[PDB]
Symmetry: C3
Subunit: 404 residues, 3 copies
């Protein structure tokens, strides 16, 4: 293959086709250079916000499109499938989600054992958010007992849109108008992400430039720990089921992985991960609208590995019970939101379970932002390969719907 | 009939059909037992909230479904009827609402005469809420001058949805798409209340268990006062108009009356009262979507009797003007919200009208919760019998629509 | 013409046809009389709010209908036009908007030369509001860095609805359902403004009555300055393009100009300006839904003249750089909101540009309310004549759509 590469054949065709994909890679390279060049800070945090503003605009655009996407996706997705067909596709997703989150936490504990307001209120608020008291409120607000904190209730909307799509599925002819209504809205918001995809290189540049303006050994532990899980463990899972090339599939969702390294939000990168699967990897719309929104807030393999490493790292300094780490890190992974720094916020639960003090989180916070950008990528990669595996396992159910 | 009852015939068929209805009755019996058994409180109010949490979840589910129900109901209801046909059905509802609220206040004053920030701002805020400045805000917020307090503006949504449904009625063919849109959404949210109906026994149990964790004579006055109005006065009104058995009709809405005793909210129990009339009592959808949402926030016969008893009870301790009590108690009844403890909040208006001090409300508050659960039932019973009476009086208008 | 007027012919026919238009003129005459008669104030501002309450209700009704109008208008408007056809109609609107705002600021500076938290944060917040992070939030909230202040994000909704309508235009057949959905909603909210049009005389009366309960020379400068621009400059622009009578056109939108003098909000008067053009002046719905919502928040000729006069008036007391006044007054005109007193709030930007102190705004505030009612009229007049000019310039594009 090395001798085959020195041919220097068709380089112009690659630059013309992957123009936007190369620009985002160029944005990361220029974003690290520009940020480190302007690293001596004679500027107030107020002036840092002005500097990272072109990246802040991209976030506003992405955060905008999440709500009409999540809602339209599940309502059409759960209506496109039959009562038993949705349960089978669901069980395939649940089995995949639980396995990948438990294998990540096992890899996380092994790698850290080789290389050296209440907790109950955090559980009740999750159950309170799964059942929102007002849907209009849920679209822009979340519950946090002291009462209703700012920011979208993604979980409550996924749960409602699921049941709502299933109810229209039972309605048939009457329910067809609303299913056709939400299918128009999904394609309408998808045609809107295509426009936002061109602003992305300008945004990502200033988004990472503004953020670069014993713990060192720990940083390597997670970063190395994620490379093993994401580039060796997860691609082999795809090859074992689909029997197809995983690194060719990972290349299609590169624009979704590069944006994750910028935003650090599974929810914010979801409208682009939808565009990456449905277009370049030619994944079925009926399953992307099924696996992708659920995996965004639940399938967090990168967080579960981070929750296992950072918890034991706290015990290393402070100087059976390791089984409860693998349980609560899996529990906090599914719980945690697909938004930035939501990895350390849910670490309160994993530390209290073993008896470790929660005041130790302050030590990690400083380097969190860099690991957050890497863990989001593993969370995006999980749903992306997660859709492809479900599609390959449910082609029989998909062929029955194509009859008409 | 006593000799006819000792037959012991078909007991298995009753347990299999009314399985869910018996479970809610069992939930009330178990809810009183469990609450009184755990009555010695070595637990903080924080721990009481944890105990009544399975009941708190049911409330979140019910409060959720009120907004898409109220909106879809009136828009289709006012569009299903003609310009003059809606005015006639309206006049039948208004006449029924005013009569039942004035007869309840007359029964209330008689029973209490036998057995021993500004008021203007409370009126202006009602007129401010009837015309909401922002519909999206109205869906989760209400006005309260100091500015816009938390909680749905049910009145503003009923008023807007009414006019909006009437405007589509005039639009005909163009307006048919939106009428067909909202009819899908109404049946979609109705299929969602069927699912919530199974959680109800688990909720109601902890909802009443958590709440049980001269004023004594007063408690009997209202409780006895409501039994006369609800079980003797109101069923005879149905028999005088429909010429049909009222206690057989009351049995159909038992799941709506039992839930009222738990939630204490006419709005929260409205999605279940809709399911009780449309199914078991086979009431027309065109009139339930017309009488039920309006009666939920206006027809409060149980509150009007409570407002008459509690006002004179305050004068009994403190030691012509009784005509103003019957007027303001009727005025506060129509005003007051279909939510818990909204009976004492509107008592400020009835006490200031006669000159009695508003600081006397503090005496009643302690026992209010128990009477609140009983008065809600009389408010639910009023709309339920209220729909059946309107349906019986408007069959000619209903037969004209069935031609097509 | 003077001899032709003494005929006293058909006076009964004018009172029967323009009954509502004469009532609003009568409301202004009675509103000035009633307000000045009750001018000796032995009443607290709390009692002033009670007095101006019948005008406050009209505002609640108007503010209500703006959000479903703005959203439905642009989505159908941008879908009714072709990709290149919307760009041409857009360029015609942009050219008209920039010319009228630059000619108003030139007239403003001439008339004042004959007759004697940060500024950057105000720019960033505009760019933050053009891209809203949550559409449900945008419908009732706006951004203001300290974080998200109360009141509708009109600009974010106009920008989203524009792109959304354009995306459905590309969708064709699939996108037709949603275009037909939003066309029903536009006509539904238009049939709702017809009802609010009858409350208008009662509202306008108390709206202006409550508001009348060197700076004197300055007041005349702007008032005279607006009469030249609005009644002499702007009608001649219409006559130069359309070749039709402008004062006959101004008569059709009189109910929209009289309401502006009451509300002082281009957004609040927009649902009535829509009813005035589409009915009395028989303007095409495809262009009113295009020019009117954009012009409401951008085309502010009355504000640009006010921003030029009041800035130089501040320099007159305090005792090349005049070019920056004409630039920033145009910049603040497009920026400023179509709501009351938004003329002095954006004056911070025009005063800082030349070096003048922002603390001088306190001097003008006292008389602002009267000039605000007059400048809103010039902003309403600008969009109204602005639609008629675009319609006359784009009849070829309109005739192609009428083929079907
Ligand atoms: C709590 O966190 C979740 C929510 C969802 C899921 C699965 C999933 C994915 N991915 C999607 N899109 O739909 C369904 C799933 C089911 O397991 C069940 C499946 C289902 C099948 C049949 C009837 C249903 C009725 C209502 C809701 C879901 C239903 C839907 C997994 C965990
Ligand atoms: C203020 O508190 C209320 C609101 C509503 C009602 C009545 C009602 C009930 N129940 C329902 N569903 O609709 C109408 C009612 C009318 O009286 C009038 C009726 C009506 C008839 C004809 C045209 C209308 C146009 C707009 C609104 C209502 C209209 C509608 C009574 C009191
Ligand atoms: C920033 O403040 C504004 C926003 C809008 C406008 C113009 C306008 C008016 N009036 C309306 N109704 O639509 C469009 C305009 C364009 O210039 C462009 C035009 C347009 C043409 C072709 C494709 C488009 C795609 C997305 C958005 C607008 C598009 C739409 C002017 C200034
Ligand atoms: N940043 C992660 C969540 C986390 O903070 O753990 C994501 O968005 O996927
Ligand atoms: N609880 C009553 C209202 C009240 O408190 O008076 C209801 O919801 O019907
Ligand atoms: N009152 C003006 C805006 C301003 O205050 O300048 C309008 O609504 O058009
Ligand atoms: Ba089907
Ligand atoms: Ba019809
Ligand atoms: Ba077309
Ligand atoms: Na997983
Ligand atoms: Na998660
Ligand atoms: Na009544
Ligand atoms: Na009421
Ligand atoms: Na202009
Ligand atoms: Na403006």
């Amino acid at each position: 293959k090395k001798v085959q590469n020195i041919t220097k054949e068709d380089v112009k065709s690659f630059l013309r086709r992957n123009a936007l994909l190369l620009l985002t890679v160029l944005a990361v390279i220029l974003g690290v250079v520009l940020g480190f060049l302007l690293r001596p800070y004679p500027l107030s945090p107020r002036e840092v916000k002005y500097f990272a503003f072109p990246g802040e605009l991209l976030m506003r655009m992405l955060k905008m499109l999440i709500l009409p996407l999540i809602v339209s996706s599940l309502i059409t997705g759960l209506a496109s499938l039959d009562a038993k067909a949705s349960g089978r596709l669901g069980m395939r997703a649940v089995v995949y989600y639980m396995s990948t989150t438990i294998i990540a936490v096992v890899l996380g504990i092994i790698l850290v054992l080789i290389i050296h307001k209440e907790v109950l209120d955090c559980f009740l608020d999750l159950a309170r958010n799964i059942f929102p008291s007002n849907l209009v409120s849920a679209a822009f607000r979340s519950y946090s007992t002291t009462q209703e904190v700012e920011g979208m209730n993604i979980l409550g909307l996924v749960v409602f849109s699921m049941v709502f799509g299933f109810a229209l599925g039972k309605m048939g002819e009457q329910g067809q108008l609303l299913v056709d209504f939400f299918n128009s809205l999904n394609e309408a918001t998808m045609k809107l992400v295509a426009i936002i995809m061109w602003y992305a290189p300008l945004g990502i540049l200033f988004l990472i430039a503004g953020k670069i303006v014993q713990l060192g050994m720990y940083m390597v532990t997670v970063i190395v720990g994620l490379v093993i899980h994401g580039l060796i463990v997860l691609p082999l899972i795809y090859f074992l089921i689909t029997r197809k090339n995983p690194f060719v599939f990972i290349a299609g969702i590169l624009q979704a992985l590069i944006t994750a390294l910028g935003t650090s939000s599974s929810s914010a990168t979801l409208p682009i991960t939808f565009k990456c699967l449905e277009e370049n990897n030619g994944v079925d719309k009926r399953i992307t609208r099924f696996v992708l929104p659920v995996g965004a807030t639940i399938n967090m393999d990168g967080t579960a590995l981070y929750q296992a490493v950072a918890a034991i790292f706290i015990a290393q300094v402070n100087n059976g019970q390791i089984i409860t780490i693998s349980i609560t890190a899996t529990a906090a992974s599914i719980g945690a939101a697909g938004i930035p720094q939501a990895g350390l916020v849910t670490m309160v639960i994993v530390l209290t379970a073993v008896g470790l003090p929660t005041d130790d989180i302050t030590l990690i916070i400083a380097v969190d932002w860099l690991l957050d950008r890497f863990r989001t990528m593993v969370n995006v990669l999980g749903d992306a390969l997660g859709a492809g595996i479900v599609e390959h396992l449910s082609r029989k159910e998909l062929e029955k719907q194509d009859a008409e």
